[PDB]
Design a protein around this ligand. Structure first.
Ligand SMILES: O=C1Nc2cccc(O)c2/C1=C/c1ccc2[nH]cnc2c1
Ligand SMILES: O=C1Nc2cccc(O)c2/C1=C/c1ccc2[nH]cnc2c1
Ligand SMILES: O=C1Nc2cccc(O)c2/C1=C/c1ccc2[nH]cnc2c1
Ligand SMILES: O=C1Nc2cccc(O)c2/C1=C/c1ccc2[nH]cnc2c1
Ligand SMILES: O=C1Nc2cccc(O)c2/C1=C/c1ccc2[nH]cnc2c1
Ligand SMILES: [Zn+2]
Ligand SMILES: [Zn+2]
Ligand SMILES: [Zn+2]
Lengths: 323, 323, 323, 323, 323
């Protein structure tokens, strides 16, 4: 072995000064997101649907148009399901695919499948369209600072397909895209040429976005080995606050509260967690009230909470990457 | 047929009086223990390592020098790993190894393997040198009373090796020591000649110590089939306090708070829980802030708390045995 | 296929008005239940025993004599245990077995096995003799209304056998009755004739009653996919309070409090949960103080709480069933 | 545990006098079985299909009409498959089901699915329509004698559904009818009321036919626990050959040759074999030139082979049973 | 999915004229293969070793210089072993990779590991150097005719890696490279774009050469799904002898001895077998006397057998592609 698989345990962020926090907050627009990034994602988009494709395309078009040098893979692939073999398509977007080490942001871009019911269709605006767009926006806003990557550490985005069960939740039916990738990754050597290290050794932290966009969200600290990064999220919230750069926000309705969580939620982090990647699992607890109902729509999203999280998330990242 | 494997559900402590308690609190010396028992254990001691043999060795010397008739074993064994085959040696000390029934205290004596960082070394002072020292001090301090063991019950210690993961947490990369010993014990008639009962039948209660020594520990009540025993710790802690025999201690920071914990922590109790041994898992929640950092060192141990838990554990254990 | 299996996902209660609720409250008798439904069952009744058969007869008898066209079946089977192959018998009681959708109420009629000790016997009053009697007392109290059934939806009761471990709680030694019937039903097409849908697609909801009986329960909201229905028991609890209809009750000692839970409890629901049946697990957290003690007897049951739960549950059902 | 489930190991044939053998070989018509029991099933019959339902009904026509008190049970059921849950229906015809012990003859009434090709359809003459017809022709030919069952033994036919793969052969995609029924009978006390003796116990021996009906076939001795029962066929072939009653039959081309076999064949006996039911697996070895060909049709059946095997078999049966 | 996946089942060879056989048999030179392909590969080449690279590199150069448009992929991939992780590389030479249906030839190119014994080194000449060679030679011999592929059917060579155990042969420790490719192929839509047909579905038949190059070898016919292609290897054998294009060859020691085998040989075909690929396993039985000995070397190969085979294969292939 070498020892760069351990740099991640000692990596510390480069915190920002008020002046620079001001720039980031100004730097993101929730209304360009609602419109250019998000509103096209609010379609049925279950696996194999024409929405999976148009969403898939959408996602790319919007990255493909930034200036940073995003390398875009489509891991199309086949997996068995209760209704038989079916075709899935993960989207990986990478800066510096040799960037030996990577911080990874991820969501799922699929939407559960439901029959239409009294003319209503499920689009998951929280589950998980807001996370997709949040990621899209982050690329957009950080684009100029992200150019400065031509520590051997860059950023990677993943939009998994196939997160939701088709019929009914169970290990055998769920997490199609991330069960695949987790494993295809553990058996790809990194960097090219390596001999005992995989692409999983270069995932410093997997930051997973799930179920985001409802009001009054509260995220637990799930794992002890990413706690310190959670504590950063706390602090970034507290300070963006104390400087007036959050909207409709108060410390008694914080998002990241130093309460921990008992059990585990299953999600696209599990395939990775179980292989030892450190996961920062930004899923709120309790779930949104509209969870897995046709009311998980745009009408019930909370614009101001998304905007605040964009700013929190964009800071955490630049801080982690020392940009 | 004998039903002695049930005697454990109806087992009651013989609770102690305020003379007795004063006497115990008197005859335990956090400062001897710190010098004589724990300072030797504070070295890189991952399985393999010279540390490991030193510690193994240390542990046995300080037991061998006490008067009661301890019987130490060194189950050394092979088992597969991500880095190929490797060798582990558990330490089992036992009084009265025909004591049909045994109360068992236990911990792990390895230290996790970490490369060296800024010429710093991971030595695991709470994970888990302190528990090991605590156990060794308890045998010391109780020695003259343990002699009494020449209800057919006695005490037994175990110091597991290979609790930690070599690479990354998983069923397959962890608990090498305890997984091994739980099997070998499930398959060993107890008592010699028995036909249907294994040594696990003889394990009353497994008290397992992990992650002790940091300030403001809070120990959940994890299992309903050991919860009256967790009540006794609550009650011991209380009296030793109302009697003024704890140091820097207040009830607003009790250690045993009647709080119930969601999930399961993974640890050396697992192989014995899933086979039906009761466990009193003295691990705190949340873990210590220094967990699995190079800061899990001696400078960050709280003498006073460790000393308080000695008294508590020592009294628990005498009450269990009726000494 | 047809979409009726999704109906459960949109199904609303037919909430009842004050006068209706006054009627229901007056319609159930806790003492009748106690005398004629529950005292028969407080015997040693573990699988095999004379108890098990006496208990089994007793249940059907008491069902048999009602006016609604209940269809009792037995389902004797055989399963391996750590003492060999022993023989079990589940009780099903169905209304309108052609009712494509059923709401299911279920509990467990076996008693854990213990050696007599001090000439006492484990009879499992809360675990789970009381829940059996409540389901009984609901079939009686609601009989006139339940007759109306000659939305395609009716009610099944299930009394499971062999819930408890024979020696030691493990996946292998536990839930004999429910792992049997989960499977049996997942492989019985429903409605007869169908080609893609099982008897489980026609479980709207499984209400599992376990460990009810003791003073001061608190029931957590275990699952998001049944939370709306937990909320309804919150609403029922409230309104029946606001109206005088509960005894020795205060809202600061509510039964159903919006408190979600950490890790999963294992119980007859699991063979169903993981096949996708939404579950409502009316078990308390913390368990009763008498859990698996000989003291789990008649003397330690709060008749007054059980009465209050009888009423809450009886309403919950009429509201589901639109009676 | 009791005796009778061991009788099947001490069981001996009533070897039959030269004369009666004539009556037997005289009372079976090959062309009645060809027109009346066989040509009906020479149709597409994969499961679910119209052919399936037709065949299942044809089979019953014939059994139902014979004088003996055959007890018919369809066993419909559901199971997961490479195209999703699908439904399956075994057939079981039983005499004296109170008869604790049953000699059991079995085969598979489905056809394997193929697209069409050349406007040609796969029908499974060998695999396994002929096995089926043979069992019918058998129950006819012997009905007058079977009638005598009003040792506690009797006979049972079983036609399995869904033995063949939907897609490709795998333990997950095959033997749907036998994996099922094995389990259903493993879990079924026999005789009614029993507490340790399943319905497999009373399976004396399992004669499974398969791919029968091409010319010049070879049946290896497969299992030691039935080689005694194989030797009798070897003996039965001989003596019927020596006595003139075969047709077109060399002894230097016997059907039952001494010649053990190396590996196993996967077939509807596995499930019943893993659980220790004595099997007699009349499948040829090799397989017919036509196997899983469009040509496995009626033109390439040899009337004489089949007629030869109906004689052997029916004598095998009557000897086993003491008629 | 449609039906082209079934074309194989009905695919027929374009048998050859005795004019052509000569034309072909003339066209292979056992001696150039012997100094141009075979000898380079006779080197230590277990996985990870420089000989592994040296051999891999040799394989391609030769295919590179060929006229056809062979498309060599390189499947470097990482897997777990008893010595820990380690890297591995499979070679995939393909033609018309858009050819939906392929015929596939394979062997493994690694060599078992051994210590050095009295100055001897293991180079599995039999195992399986010759096979790498025989396949290369075929690609030569026929290139001009392969050229004609620009039914949608073509050809593919696969040289696996890590076929040989590292230590003690076992499922977990063998076929590293083929287990990895069956899975990667199982999950890769073929053709590009499809929605339920994998790359395995294009494998019409996998021809697997192993342990070839001793004298007088008997290849059994292992599988019924491919016996009709074993018979073609007879027909071709037997006709080339009587035409005299075989050397040192009697028809009293034919290789393809229509003789059936019992059990299954574990080898690289297995992962492909249990996913339903049709396999023609050309591994003699018994294995060479040299097997897994220092003596499995050039000295003990039989130039004449090898050339012979070299001729049957090439014919078989030409007959499969109709060329
Ligand atoms: O999909 C699901 N079906 C369920 C049925 C019963 C209980 C459950 O917890 C679930 C469930 C969980 C879940 C977890 C993360 C998710 N992210 C987006 N949708 C998400 C869903
Ligand atoms: O070793 C570990 N690596 C992890 C990565 C993510 C989450 C985790 O809980 C762990 C973990 C757990 C753990 C549990 C009990 C222990 N006792 C002593 N060390 C202990 C460690
Ligand atoms: O049976 C059990 N033996 C245990 C030993 C240690 C820890 C445990 O949680 C259990 C346990 C659980 C349990 C769960 C649900 C039940 N419902 C009725 N009895 C119940 C018992
Ligand atoms: O169905 C099958 N598809 C295969 C593909 C490759 C190799 C094989 O051995 C098989 C196979 C076996 C088989 C076994 C018993 C049968 N009884 C009736 N049809 C039968 C078929
Ligand atoms: O590797 C092996 N070790 C064994 C030990 C005992 C019995 C066996 O059949 C084997 C064995 C089989 C085998 C199969 C294909 C091979 N190709 C090259 N080596 C090959 C070896
Ligand atoms: Zn640790
Ligand atoms: Zn219980
Ligand atoms: Zn070999």
């Amino acid at each position: 072995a070498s020892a760069w698989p351990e740099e991640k345990n000692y990596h510390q962020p480069a915190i920002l000064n008020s002046s620079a926090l001001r720039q980031i907050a100004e730097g993101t627009s929730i209304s360009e997101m609602w419109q250019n990034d998000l509103q096209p994602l609010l379609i049925e988009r279950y696996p194999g649907s024409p929405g999976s494709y148009a969403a898939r395309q959408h996602i790319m078009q919007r990255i493909q148009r930034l200036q940073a040098d995003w390398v875009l893979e489509i891991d199309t692939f086949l997996s068995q399901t209760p209704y038989g073999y079916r075709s899935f398509s993960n989207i990986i977007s990478t800066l510096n695919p040799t960037a030996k080490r990577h911080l990874v942001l991820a969501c799922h871009y699929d939407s559960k499948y439901f029959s239409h019911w009294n003319n209503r269709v499920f689009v998951g605006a929280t589950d998980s369209a807001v996370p997709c767009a949040m990621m899209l926006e982050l690329a957009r806003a950080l684009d100029k600072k992200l150019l400065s990557l031509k520590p051997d550490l860059s950023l990677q985005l993943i939009f998994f397909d196939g997160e939701e069960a088709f019929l009914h939740w169970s290990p055998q039916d769920s997490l199609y895209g991330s069960r695949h990738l987790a494993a295809k990754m553990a058996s790809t050597p990194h960097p090219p040429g390596a001999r005992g290290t995989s692409q999983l050794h270069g995932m410093d932290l997997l930051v997973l976005l799930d179920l985001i966009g409802a009001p009054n969200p509260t995220f637990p600290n799930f794992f002890p080995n990413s706690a310190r990064w959670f504590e950063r999220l706390q602090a970034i919230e507290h300070e963006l606050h104390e400087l007036g750069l959050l909207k409709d926000h108060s410390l008694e309705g914080r998002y990241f509260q130093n309460y921990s969580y008992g059990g585990v939620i299953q999600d696209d982090h599990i395939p990775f967690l179980r292989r030892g990647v450190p996961v920062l699992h930004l899923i709120p607890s309790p779930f949104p009230e509209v969870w897995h109902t046709m009311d998980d729509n745009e009408e019930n999203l909370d614009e101001s909470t998304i905007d605040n999280l964009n700013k929190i998330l964009q800071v955490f990242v630049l801080e982690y990457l020392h940009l």
